[PDB]
Amino acid sequence: EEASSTGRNFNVEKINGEWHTIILASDKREKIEDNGNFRLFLEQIHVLEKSLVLKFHTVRDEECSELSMVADKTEKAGEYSVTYDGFNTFTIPKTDYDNFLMAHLINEKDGETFQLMGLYGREPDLSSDIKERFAQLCEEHGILRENIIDLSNANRC
């Protein structure tokens, strides 16, 4: 079964655990390119009562660096917020819990904004069919495929 974090049947505890950044997408490509602040490699999601603890690592000059963030539930069901290089809110428009998780995020910094979409997998890669479903979801948010970056052969340290 698949669900949306904003859906009536969403079970947040089922997204707990191991996750890997498979593909990142953005309408501001630089944010997820080699030195962008949003090229984050997810490692796990710890589901709490009113928040999610996200553990990521970044890379610079082939060197991994750990970083944790706490995303708090907001007044909108299925929506979380977190301060990081500006103010961010995100939802999970689609997840099947056991294979993939697709997140849609809005960042607001210095009076501006950009969208970030992420495809995370329980394993360090996902099937071409799931990757195609992600490209369709990105398209529905106005993000061109050329702004979608597959990081599957670059997510391990």
From Swiss-Prot:
Read off the Gene3D superfamilies from this record: 2.40.128.20
> Which keywords accompany this UniProt record?
Disulfide bond, Pheromone-binding, Secreted, Signal, Transport
Biological process terms from the Gene Ontology for this record are:
aerobic respiration; cellular response to lipid; energy reserve metabolic process; glucose homeostasis; heat generation; locomotor rhythm; mitochondrion organization; negative regulation of DNA-templated transcription
Q: What is its main location?
A: secreted
Keyword Glycoprotein, does the record have it?
Answer: no
**Cysteines paired by S-S bonds:** 64-157
| Gene Ontology terms, MF aspect | insulin receptor activity; pheromone binding; small molecule binding
Location(s) in or outside the cell? Secreted
InterPro entries (UniProt xref): Calycin, Lipocalin, Lipocalin_CS, Lipocln_cytosolic_FA-bd_dom, Maj_urinary
Its biological purpose is as follows:
Binds pheromones that are released from drying urine of males. These pheromones affect the sexual behavior of females.
Quote the PANTHER family the UniProt record gives: LIPOCALIN, MAJOR URINARY PROTEIN 1-RELATED
Q: Spell out the protein name for this chain.
A: Major urinary protein 2
Native source organism of the sequence: Mus musculus
Its gene name is Mup2
